[PDB]
């Protein structure tokens, strides 16, 4: 609905705030995974025996 | 059709940057470092050490002499293998 | 596809050890936030002005 | 926790809304391969390092500290005896010097 979006524009930057917060959470999760698992810069391998 | 409806309502799930296989690869690298090099790889270059000598170093860390580990090496290895098997059985047999 | 890191096969054997013969004194930086900007809002003046 | 490497000390620095820690750490470098053994068999007794590790450069056996290469002669002062040579897996035969031996010999 275009008319709904036009009425939604009167409320300001609520949509931008919600998108920014979700984007921050989304990058935060990847940062969490990097912090926990990507703690070595060398990929070590076990000997064949 | 829960996922389809959630997608269709303007909510989109974004894939993790690290895929499960790469996270598994990172865990494999950490396991290879801690097994072949002990704690050396975490503090600098990976220095190879035999695993019984590494376990003896860890025994010294908790205040037990090296001889206790070396004399009872087969018993300690059997206990560790049994414990790992018990861990796999416990995870497979418990829903919670 | 992103590279996790450089492959480094450690030469593990049952009777060989690697001993450091030298050292590097490395200084590294760690930045930690401690405080934020302290904000006070006059609720009546913000919502209603005068 | 306090930098990459074995932590030696840290220095605090003020920053706008924050702190910067300069972590001074010890990083091992220029590592060298050595042949290692868990214990030394001498006179039917097993000798274990008191604080170090047994290393071999190819022909001779020494005891050195784990985090830096400083080879020293294997004596009764830096090793301790626990048991015979029949139990430890990978024990090698080498002599263990006695400081008291030249003293009572002369
Ligand atoms: C210790 O010796 C091992 C092998 O005896 C060395 O490992 C080799 O390193 C070269 C160059 O890095 C590789 O091309 C070989 O494939 C490695 N061999 C194995 C079996 O991994 C190791 O580099 C030596 N350590 C030092 C510090 O020189
Ligand atoms: C240990 O490494 C240091 C450097 O980390 C070496 O010092 C260097 O020695 C060469 C020749 O003696 C000089 O040209 C360099 O300027 C020195 N560097 C520094 C930072 O002082 C030292 O020689 C190494 N020691 C051993 C036994 O390998
Ligand atoms: C391992 O180190 C020892 C001691 O540093 C070496 O023994 C000496 O070797 C030099 C030259 O080869 C001789 O002049 C000395 O007489 C030796 N000392 C003793 C007490 O015998 C030994 O050669 C080194 N091994 C290798 C393979 O380099
Ligand atoms: C280390 O020394 C011991 C004792 O000198 C050696 O054990 C002897 O081995 C010979 C040959 O195999 C046998 O005939 C003797 O009966 C053994 N004696 C004892 C008390 O066990 C042992 O072989 C040596 N090990 C190495 C690797 O040289
Ligand atoms: C080390 O392994 C090699 C071959 O893998 C074998 O010949 C040797 O007996 C082993 N030594 C010890 C102390 O286990």
UniProtKB/Swiss-Prot annotation, chain C:
Record: glycosylation sites: 14, 22
Effect of residue 21 to I: In strain: Alpha/B.1.1.7
Highest taxon listed in the record's lineage: Viruses
Its biological purpose: Precursor of the fusion protein processed in the biosynthesis of the S protein and the formation of virus particle. Mediates fusion of the virion and cellular membranes by functioning as a class I viral fusion protein. Contains two viral fusion peptides that are unmasked after cleavage. The S2/S2' cleavage occurs during virus entry at the cell membrane by host TMPRSS2 or during endocytosis by host CSTL.
Protein name per UniProt: Spike protein S2
Organism: Severe acute respiratory syndrome coronavirus 2
Organism ancestry: Viruses, Riboviria, Orthornavirae, Pisuviricota, Pisoniviricetes
Designated gene of the protein: S
Residues of the full protein shown: 696 to 745 of 1273
